[PDB]
Amino acid sequence: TAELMDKAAQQLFTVLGELKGGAMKVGQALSVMEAAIPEQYGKPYREALTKLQKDAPPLPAAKVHRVLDAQLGTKWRDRFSSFDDKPVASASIGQVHKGIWSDGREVAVKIQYPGADEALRADLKTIQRLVGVFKQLAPGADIQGVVDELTERTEMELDYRLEADNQRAFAKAYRNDPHFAVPAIIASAPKVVISEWMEGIPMSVIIREGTPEQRDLMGTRLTELTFGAPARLEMMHGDAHPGNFMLLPDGRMGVIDFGAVAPLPGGFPTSLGETIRLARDKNYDELLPTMERAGFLQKGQEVSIEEVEDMLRQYVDPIKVDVFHYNRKWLQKMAASQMDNSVAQIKMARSLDLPANLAIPLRVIASTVAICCQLDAHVPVKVIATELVPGFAEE
C-alpha cells in the first residue's frame, strides 16, 4: 500500500541522512536503484545520494603526497613535469588528480582512500540493513545483487594493480575501436594508478542535460559494451556507475574506471540468448526445459507459464522492437509490486540453481539497463543482441 511505501521511504532517508562523514561507496552503489524506486521519491533520493558523496571529505594534498611517496617512492615527483594538488573528481575508492607526465602527456592519477577496506565493510552492513526497505520500495528490482557486489569487493584486497591489468586488457581488446576508447595505463601500484588523461562529457552530465542523440548514443555504447566484452575478451566491464563513462568528441564512449570488472571464462552461455529468443517466440515447450537445464528455473519447483512470462518480460520487451526506448517509467513499472495476486513474482536472477556465469551477466545487464533508463536512451537492443549474444539469433 501507499502507507507502507511511505514508511519504507522514511526509513531509507533516515538511514541515508544519519550518515555524516563518509558513505561515498554507498552513494555510488545505490545509483542503480534510483530509476527503479517510485518517482515521488526520485528527487530527494538523488539529493541524498549526492550529499553522501559531497560530505565525504577529500584527501588533503599533503596526505596524497604521502600516499604517492609510499606507493611510487620518495622521488615520485621526478615522474612528473607537474602535478595538480586540487582533485578533479572521485572514482569509487579513489581520488583523482590531473598531472603532466615528465614526457609531456596529460595524466590522471588515482589515489586510493586510506581507510578503504573498513569503509567498504561499514558501508556493506549499511546497505544490508536497507535490503528490506528496497524490497518494499522496488520489489521487482534486485537490491540483493547490490549487496552481493559489495560483499564480493569486501572479499579481496583493494589492489589497484589488478584494476590496471584489467584496464590494459580492455585497452588491448578495444584498440583503435570505432566506438570505445580506453585510457592507456602508464603506471600502477596497490594504491595508485596512473593513466593517460581522457577528455570528454561525463555520462552523469548526459543523464541530466544530454540531447536525445547523446543519450541514445551513450545507451547504445553501454549496451554494446555489455553484450560484447564477453565475446571480445571473456570479461564484463561489470557493475557500472555513470562516473565510469564519458562521451568523446569523436563519438566514442570513453571507459575510464575498471574497478568492477568481472571475469567471464567462456563468455555468455548460449542458454541466455536461447532463453530470451524462445521466450519471445512463446515456445514454452522448449523454453522451460532450457531454463531448467541452465539453472534459470530451480529444478523440481513447479512454475506456471504465466509466472515464466512475467519473469522474462524485462529481458524480452527490449528486443521485441527494432529500437527500444529505455526510460524511468518502464523501469519503475518493472520494479513495482504486482497489481493483484494473479501471478507470483519469481526472480530468475535469484534462482537457487543459477550458476555464476549466468548470475554475473544478469547483474551487469541490470546495471546497464538501469543506466539506459536514467539516460532515457533509445537503443537498438535487438540487432546488437543478434550480433553479439550467443544463441539469440534465429536458427
In the structure grid, which three cell numbers stand for residue 361, read together? 551477466
In the structure grid, which three cell numbers stand for residue 15, read together? 538511514
The reported resolution of this PDB entry, expressed in Å, is 2.0
In the structure grid, which three cell numbers stand for residue 137, read together? 520500495
267 is in an annotated binding site: no
CA–CA separation, 160 and 90 (whole Å): 15
The helix, strand and coil proportions of the chain, stated in percent and rounded to the nearest 5, come to 55, 15, 30
Phi, psi of 379 (to 5 degrees): -125, 135
CA–CA separation, 383 and 236 (whole Å): 20
CA–CA separation, 299 and 282 (whole Å): 21
- Closest residue by Cα to residue 259 from 146, 118, 364, 164: 164
282 is in an annotated binding site: no
Residue 264 and residue 235 in contact, taking contact as beta carbons nearer than 8 Å = yes
42 is in an annotated binding site: no
CA–CA separation, 100 and 104 (whole Å): 6
Residue 247 and residue 254 in contact, taking contact as beta carbons nearer than 8 Å = yes
Residue 140 and residue 335 in contact, taking contact as beta carbons nearer than 8 Å = yes
Q: What are the chain's domains? A: 2-56+116-155 (no CATH), 61-112+159-196 (3.30.200.20), 198-395 (no CATH)
3-class DSSP assignment, residue 20: coil
CA–CA separation, 28 and 262 (whole Å): 18
Sheet containing strand 201-202, strands side by side = 180-181, 253-255, 245-247, 201-202
93: Cβ contacts below 8 Å, ≥ 6 apart: 24, 25, 112, 113, 116, 119, 120, 158, 259
196 is in an annotated binding site: yes
- Closest residue by Cα to residue 97 from 105, 85, 106: 85
257 is in an annotated binding site: yes
243 is in an annotated binding site: yes
CA–CA separation, 369 and 378 (whole Å): 12
What is the per-residue DSSP string for 296-363? Answer: SS-TT----HHHHHHHHHHHHGGGSSSSEE--HHHHHHHHS--SSSSS----GGG-TT--HHHHHHHH
**CA-angle at 298, arms to 292 and 301, nearest 5°:** 105
Contacts by 276-285, CB closer than 8 A, 24 or more apart: 276/312, 276/315, 276/316, 276/319, 276/385, 276/389, 276/392, 277/391, 277/392, 277/393, 277/394, 279/308, 279/309, 279/312, 279/315, 279/316, 280/316, 280/319, 280/320, 282/309, 284/308
Q: How was this structure determined?
A: X-ray
353 is in an annotated binding site: no
Other CB atoms within 10 Å distance of the CB of residue 383:
12
Contacts by 359-365, CB closer than 8 A, 24 or more apart: 360/236, 360/262, 360/264, 361/230, 361/236, 361/264, 361/268, 361/272, 362/145, 363/142, 363/145, 363/148, 363/149, 363/239, 364/226, 364/236, 364/237, 364/238, 364/239, 364/240, 364/262, 365/226, 365/315
Q: With residue 27 as reference, give the H or E element that holds it.
A: helix 24-29
